[PDB]
Paper text:
Here, we report higher resolution (3.4–3.8 Å) structures of P-gp bound to a series of rationally engineered selenium-labelled cyclopeptide compounds that were designed to probe the ligand-binding pocket of P-gp. The R groups of this series were systematically varied to generate alanine-, valine-, leucine- and phenylalanine-derived compounds (QZ-Ala, QZ-Val, QZ-Leu and QZ-Phe, respectively) of increasing R-group size and hydrophobicity. All four compounds also prevented P-gp-mediated export of the anticancer drug colchicine and sensitized CR1R12 cells in a dose-dependent manner. Fitting the data to the Hill equation gave Hill coefficients of >1 in each case, suggesting positive cooperativity for their binding to at least two sites. In previous structures of apo mouse P-gp, and also for ligands pertaining to subset B, TM4 adopts a mostly straight-helical conformation characterized by weaker electron density, indicative of regional flexibility. Here, we only demonstrate two distinct changes in TM4 (kinked or straight helical) caused by two different subsets of ligands. In doing so, we reveal how drug substrates (i) may enter the transporter, (ii) bind at multiple, shared yet discrete sites in the transmembrane domain (TMD) and (iii) might transmit this information to the NBDs to stimulate ATP hydrolysis. Together, these new structures provide snapshots of how structurally similar ligands, differing only in side-chain R-group size, can bind prior to drug efflux.
The transporter P-glycoprotein (P-gp; ABCB1; EC 3.6.3.44) is expressed in the intestines, liver, kidney and blood–brain barrier, and affects the bioavailability, pharmacokinetics and efficacy of drugs. The transporter consists of two pseudosymmetric halves encoded into a single polypeptide. Each half is formed by six transmembrane helices (TMs) and one cytosolic nucleotide-binding domain (NBD) along with interconnecting loops and short helices.
Numbering used by the authors:
A (entry chain A): 30 to 626, 689 to 1278
B (entry chain B), C (entry chain C): 1 to 6
Write the structure that this text describes.
Amino acid sequence: KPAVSVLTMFRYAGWLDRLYMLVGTLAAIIHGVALPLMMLIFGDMTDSFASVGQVSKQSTQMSEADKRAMFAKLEEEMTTYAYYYTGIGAGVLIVAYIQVSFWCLAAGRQIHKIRQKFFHAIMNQEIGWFDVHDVGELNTRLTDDVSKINEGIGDKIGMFFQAMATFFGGFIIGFTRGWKLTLVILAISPVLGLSAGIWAKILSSFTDKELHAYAKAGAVAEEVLAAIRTVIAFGGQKKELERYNNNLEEAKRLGIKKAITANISMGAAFLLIYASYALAFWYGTSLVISKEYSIGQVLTVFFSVLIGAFSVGQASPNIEAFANARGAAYEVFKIIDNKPSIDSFSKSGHKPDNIQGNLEFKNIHFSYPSRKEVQILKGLNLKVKSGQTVALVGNSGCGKSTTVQLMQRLYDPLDGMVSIDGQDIRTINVRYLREIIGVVSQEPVLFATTIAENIRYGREDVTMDEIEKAVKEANAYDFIMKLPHQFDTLVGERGAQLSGGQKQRIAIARALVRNPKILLLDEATSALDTESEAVVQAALDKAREGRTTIVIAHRLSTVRNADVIAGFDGGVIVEQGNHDELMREKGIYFKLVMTQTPPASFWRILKLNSTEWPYFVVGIFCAIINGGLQPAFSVIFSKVVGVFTNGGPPETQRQNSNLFSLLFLILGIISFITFFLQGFTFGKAGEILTKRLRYMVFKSMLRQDVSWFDDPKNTTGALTTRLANDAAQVKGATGSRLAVIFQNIANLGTGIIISLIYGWQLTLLLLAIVPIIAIAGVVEMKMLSGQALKDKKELEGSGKIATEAIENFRTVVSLTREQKFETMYAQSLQIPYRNAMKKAHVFGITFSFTQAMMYFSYAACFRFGAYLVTQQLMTFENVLLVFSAIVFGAMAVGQVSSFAPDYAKATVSASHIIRIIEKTPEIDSYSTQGLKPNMLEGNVQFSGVVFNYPTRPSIPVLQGLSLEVKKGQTLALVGSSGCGKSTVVQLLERFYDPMAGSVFLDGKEIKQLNVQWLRAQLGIVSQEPILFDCSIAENIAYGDNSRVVSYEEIVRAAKEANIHQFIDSLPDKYNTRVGDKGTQLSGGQKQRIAIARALVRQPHILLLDEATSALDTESEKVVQEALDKAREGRTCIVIAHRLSTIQNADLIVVIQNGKVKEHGTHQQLLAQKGIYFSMVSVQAGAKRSLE
Amino acid sequence: XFXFXF
Amino acid sequence: XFXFXF
């Protein structure tokens, strides 16, 4: 929203830039004025043929006499006009090039400076400024906003002024050639602007509505695909598919409605355009018959004014372009204009020599820019003698690090002063200060380049000798020399990830090259392995002894040798002294011491919509008729001016112009019928297959097994997105575009037949010209994208070094060498800059070439139309017809190139949607095959089962697992940890078939059993049961599908689950809605409902998976009571984590590494002393302990 | 050429 | 270059 003064935005343009912009906008205005002058001459041409057209037909006596004066008039006149046109061509060529080239040049030249200055400004900021701002947003802000600014100051301005020039020029010529027709053409303008408004208002409203419909279905789809395992378990797939299908059923209806309305609107708009357009022309004729206007003048003012009219609409977008650019330039310049307190790019202040390194902190109060919320340092006093080494210690708050933070003058203290030697730290130059101080940080960072270069970030001027001595003095020489490439080895986030201690040593070496008088070590030893810690500690100790040092860490192994140790409490310095003294003090220090001791292009996609043989032929026939209707608009306009030019005796004219002007409209109204049709037939055809596809996609998505849903590649969101997009995309390829293409080929076809049969070689000529300028138009767009992509690749590299610089910034400021990144960034930018120079050279040529070719083409038009054709008996009225017809065939063909990417995108999107359908699972719930045993009583046999999850075939969950459980008895399953306990329940549901081994129930192998029937006999209850949005009775009735559950039945089930307390209490009772849309319930109720749907099914096998997992207090008690009442009448497998509730179980089984380890009744496992005994003792010790 | 046919 | 804008 905030803007920028127009002058400040251009502040980086001076001398040649302003010149370029001036000559540019000049040439632009010229280019603009050029076109309406073209239409001015066009009226003078009509007058020439009109003068001869009347006289030629006025004779009806002498013939040869008309071969003399007429041909001479046409000779001189046509030659003059052709000469002029040729004149215009060179002009538009030159001015076009000048315009685009100059403006693009200016843009590039400026944006270069913008980028450099901006990055500099980013680097120049103090750390306090970073602390409050998101770096990602800032970097993206750089890359994107500078691009917006680029788009703003670019050639768009030239286009804008050019359009304004066509506007003024058009209306100037319009007015001067006459006032009436212009005012009459202005009279219609409000009517057109309103019709375009009705066009707009409908889109914004309905586009939202269209998104809303799929959001209601998408909700079903999402909750389902989120609940996939549950719906799989209970086998309610047909129901979910049904619901989704119903939602689609609604969606398509809303769709066809929108189609009808939209098509009606478009048709009406087209009708208004036709009507006004014809009307103005009729009035024109009415003015020509009065001899008030010449027949050509009418054309001139008409076209000039309409040109001038559209120029506005064509101009407007370039306003928004420049508008956005100011808004973007605001936040950009804000940082560049911002001058900090600290600078560090400044050369100022003292640079002391022979620093002894006597440091003192005096009464320092400070807070980070969280400001008044917390004040970490309340007062302070500290000294450290020259050559000494002080160690800071503290319990928490990290006020320790604050001193190291302040000693680099990253922040100025609120009150108090940090004094290096005798002088205040603020009097001495920042850079020099940072250079005389070395720093080693807990987390070291290595910029990505050779080791030498990272060591070279200590000092720009250095030799491999100093690097060697530096790393050797840090004892890092061995480890890196053993590494390949020697000093030239790579480091960074990408590639050659090394040990922390090694990176730290490299950091210490880097710091050691700095040869600092002052050394600051903050928890550099901390957060590192104990073995390498000593290795790095050796270096750290060797890094001292030439320097004064302030060290901070959690390691009290390194503190003892310190000359002074300093404790802090609540930001207040308390204890100071040698170790023995502090241990004699028995204070905080002593305390802490004691504490720490794939394309698819097919008509196969069409074979699916081949479901409808009709609805297509209708649209195509209709659209071809429309395609045959399109050139008819030309044939009239030809003969309207044609007969009027060919009129001869005037008496018969005024009667004919009324017959055409009528007909002129008649093709209009019939255009309403055909346009609405081909839009409606294609629309309705679009919404139906969208139901068929999504219904076929969703269905087959419920076919797939859990193996496919566990895939990280497929998630609910990704599936719903893949579900929406492809179906949304295929509609576009089979939709309006195709109809338009057929309409346009039909258009050009009928047009070219008429043109070709009328004009002999007049048309054959154009057909040589036109396909060339069209192809010349497409190739231009190809070079535009090529230069665009290549440019993106080059700045991607410069933006990469920028991200590296500003993400690690707090480090680079400590090492200084920001100027390094300045220079690197510049050198990185240098290549895109020279590239942007060539861009202007190219953009101008391709533009001017395509403009000149169209003006030169317009010269060859009338030149061949006149002369050779008109010297023959061939006539002007036909020429005027052929140009219209052909050039419109072309402008219609343009829509073929414009509509190209839709099919491609739809192809890529139609690729996935067939594959997703054709994919088949290992276990398909749809198969009607399988035994369906007649015997009720369940057993379960697990024998030598081996299982690895398809997602993670590394660590096996089950190896040779063997279980057995008889009917009507509970099988308790205990385990150390893992899904092994659950994998039993998962395998019995047959979500997976095990790698090796086998599992039986009635003695039949479930693998050969019917999947649905198998799953139909199971009582599964999970940890956190998901309930879909619908009546709780429908959530309970979900337990049994293929049949509607009785009320008294879900009542009985609700009674068995002890949830009846809630259900009878609610106002809506069993009709109440749950699932967070209409109501909220706690875990207890939800679980009891899960139990209800579990036992409404009347399973012979109950499966309780950690049912009490998330729960508390009495809820566990009542839910366990329910679960306990639920079993004992059925086969059961209970993996619950409360072993106090397993104490009554028919069989307990301890799982170990996939093998059953211990098994037996409680008292037997208790009689034994082993895993189960420990499992029970450890958690049994808790309940006794809670007292 | 505008949008009818010339 | 006819009457829309090209």
